[PDB]
């Protein structure tokens, strides 16, 4: 999932954008994937309970 960024591939976005402009899309991917992982662990906790 692109998560509203340039692309969903970390390596491709790093190789296509410089650090001090790409870190914004990096943070976008970070927060999207991190919210996804939080949802997954919350649902897994529900299922485990």
């Amino acid at each position: 999932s692109k998560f509203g960024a340039i692309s969903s591939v970390l390596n491709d976005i790093l190789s296509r954008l410089d650090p001090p402009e790409a870190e914004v899309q990096i943070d976008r991917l970070i927060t999207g994937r991190l919210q996804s992982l939080q949802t997954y662990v919350t649902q897994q906790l529900i299922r485990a309970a």
């Binding site: 340039i6 190789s15 296509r16 954008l17 410089d18 402009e21 790409a22």
Partner: protein, 48 residues
């Protein structure tokens, strides 16, 4: 040849050229123009 032209077409009929089957080294672009706006959107000029 794109930046060496003398009769750049008007914006109403903007000339459009295709660039393929070559090696793009943007040093010639950097030294071929006194840039005023180099606003890149999809790719950073640094790693171009």
């Amino acid at each position: 040849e794109v930046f060496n032209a003398t009769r750049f077409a008007s914006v109403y009929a903007w000339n459009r050229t295709r660039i393929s089957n070559c090696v793009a080294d943007y040093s010639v672009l950097y030294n071929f123009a006194p840039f005023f706006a180099f606003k890149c959107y999809g790719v950073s000029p640094t790693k171009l």
